[PDB]
Amino acid sequence: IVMPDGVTGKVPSLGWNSWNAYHCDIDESKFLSAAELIVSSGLLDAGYNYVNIDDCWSMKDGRVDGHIAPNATRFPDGIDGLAKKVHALGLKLGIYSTAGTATCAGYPASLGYEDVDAADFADWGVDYLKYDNCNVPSDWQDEYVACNPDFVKTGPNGTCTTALDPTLAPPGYDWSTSKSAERFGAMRNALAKQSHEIVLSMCIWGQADVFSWGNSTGISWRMSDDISPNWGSVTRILNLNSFKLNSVDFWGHNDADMLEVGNGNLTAAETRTHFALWAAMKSPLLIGTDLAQLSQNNINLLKNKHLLAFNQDSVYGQPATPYKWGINPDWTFNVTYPAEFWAGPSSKGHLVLMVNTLDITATKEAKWNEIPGLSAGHYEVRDVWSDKDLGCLSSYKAAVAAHDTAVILVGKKCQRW
Ligand SMILES: *[C@@H]1O[C@H](CO)[C@@H](O[C@@H]2O[C@H](CO)[C@@H](O[C@@H]3O[C@H](CO[C@H]4O[C@H](CO)[C@@H](O)[C@H](O[C@H]5O[C@H](CO)[C@@H](O)[C@H](O)[C@@H]5O)[C@@H]4O)[C@@H](O)[C@H](O[C@H]4O[C@H](CO)[C@@H](O)[C@H](O[C@H]5O[C@H](CO)[C@@H](O)[C@H](O)[C@@H]5O)[C@@H]4O)[C@@H]3O)[C@H](O)[C@H]2NC(C)=O)[C@H](O)[C@H]1NC(C)=O
Numbered sequence: 547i548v549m550p551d552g553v554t555g556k557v558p559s560l561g562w563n564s565w566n567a568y569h570c571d572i573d574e575s576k577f578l579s580a581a582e583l584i585v586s587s588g589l590l591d592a593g594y595n596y597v598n599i600d601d602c603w604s605m606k607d608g609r610v611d612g613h614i615a616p617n618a619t620r621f622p623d624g625i626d627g628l629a630k631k632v633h634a635l636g637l638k639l640g641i642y643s644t645a646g647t648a649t650c651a652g653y654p655a656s657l658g659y660e661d662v663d664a665a666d667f668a669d670w671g672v673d674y675l676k677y678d679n680c681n682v683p684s685d686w687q688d689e690y691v692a693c694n695p696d697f698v699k700t701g702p703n704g705t706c707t708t709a710l711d712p713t714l715a716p717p718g719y720d721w722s723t724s725k726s727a728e729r730f731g732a733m734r735n736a737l738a739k740q741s742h743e744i745v746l747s748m749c750i751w752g753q754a755d756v757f758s759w760g761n762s763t764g765i766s767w768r769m770s771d772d773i774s775p776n777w778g779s780v781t782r783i784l785n786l787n788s789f790k791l792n793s794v795d796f797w798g799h800n801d802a803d804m805l806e807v808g809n810g811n812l813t814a815a816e817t818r819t820h821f822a823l824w825a826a827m828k829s830p831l832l833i834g835t836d837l838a839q840l841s842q843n844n845i846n847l848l849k850n851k852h853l854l855a856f857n858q859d860s861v862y863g864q865p866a867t868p869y870k871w872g873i874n875p876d877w878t879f880n881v882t883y884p885a886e887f888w889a890g891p892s893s894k895g896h897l898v899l900m901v902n903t904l905d906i907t908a909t910k911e912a913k914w915n916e917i918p919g920l921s922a923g924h925y926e927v928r929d930v931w932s933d934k935d936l937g938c939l940s941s942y943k944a945a946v947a948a949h950d951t952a953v954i955l956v957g958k959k960c961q962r963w
Pocket residue numbers: 703787788789790791792867868869876877878879
């Protein structure tokens with residue numbers, strides 16, 4: 547969705563969110579520390595400007611006089627006070643609610659209270675709303691389910707049938723008028739009435755075919771169930787998103803979920819793959835780890851100037867897309883062996899990414915004729931990881947470590963042949 551100021555939300559949101567770092571165990575100090583570290587580490591300089599509050603911020607046990615109350619134990623100066631502090635550092639503040647009767651963690655939520663909550667969030671100076679999808683009561687549930695392989699039983703190749711799920715929507719169903727669309731549109735409309743600009747992140751997990759109606763409603767939409775800090779989760783979301791990239795352009799980006807950089811059992815290679823593909827798919831990039839414990843190597847990864855420039859390109863709205871699946875035939879839905887060969891144009895040239903989904907080193911080759919927008923011949927090439935010149939090349943062949951991604955930027959043609 548386009549926003550009134552003509553800029554905010556046009557390219558993907560960059561920031562930090564408490565959830566993958568702290569889950570339900572949050573307080574004001576955690577946000578202030580995050581804000582200070584985003585500035586001092588250079589992350590703000592790299593473009594990361596949102597400090598986003600996730601679930602568990604309010605008094606759990608009900609509204610106070612019809613309003614969601616901040617938990618004052620956690621936020622002694624309120625959300626408004628926190629917003630002041632964050633804004634003084636040149637940053638923006640995000641908050642969280644749910645399009646249901648309680649949040650996913652059981653806190654007050656906004657279904658039927660969209661105008662009241664929007665007004666409070668705006669009065670506090672909040673800049674960004676993550677709006678989750680738990681706890682939808684009967685009179686607001688959808689009639690049917692959409693074919694979302696993360697939530698519905700599938701046959702081969704991620705296909706749905708009413709034999710597999712008798713509540714699967716009939717052929718031709720118009721999701722743009724489902725109850726899910728209504729629930730999210732109600733919050734769109736409430737936020738749009740406020741005299742403070744709040745962008746809407748639609749945390750709907752790829753449900754209700756948000757791909758078809760999302761752009762009319764918010765700036766971004768989750769496209770899968772919740773991420774976990776492991777390779778299986780990374781490949782699952784990569785596979786799912788690889789089929790949905792025609793929904794991604796200016797003002798409306800599929801959200802591959804909060805980054806797991808620095809977390810869990812992800813290896814160095816797996817972490818590069820995750821970051822690089824989230825960037826290239828033009829998902830919002832929300833850091834989700836305690837920055838006080840994040841290695842400099844991971845900080846430097848998050849600041850990768852080429853991946854950030856690509857993600858943030860103000861001329862090319864579309865993401866990198868798969869040009870060859872690799873181990874499987876093109877367009878094969880597979881949660882463990884997603885599409886390997888990706889590319890897309892930008893102001894700085896064509897970004898090309900080659901994911902090694904095998905668990906041993908493998909040679910991978912970027913062949914220009916295979917890549918949309920390029921043709922046989924020689925191009926000037928740069929390695930995105932090392933920022934080194936790779937020369938004037940007729941193709942690019944690399945040994946890629948297990949679960950790593952080779953990433954290059956293809957510049958000008960350097961010979962006609
Ligand atoms: C498993 O499930 C998946 C997901 O549902 C199914 O995926 C199908 O697979 C189809 C092929 O079986 C595939 O059809 C191809 O479509 C391309 C055009 O693709 C563009 O436009 C489509 C419609 O709007 C989009 O769906 C595409 O988006 C998808 O792909 C992009 C990446 O490419 C992703 O970014 C995106 O997220 C999404 O996944 C995309 O925007 C056709 O070009 C292609 O046509 C082929 O046969 C034609 C002959 O009839 C021929 O004319 C074509 O020419 C090509 O090759 C020629 C050389 O022979 C060249 O000369 C031409 O220049 C050209 O390059 C070509 O040979 C084919 O129709 C669908 O797009 C895809 N749908 C989706 C949503 O992904 C699988 O089929 C399932 N697998 C099994 C098995 O069941």
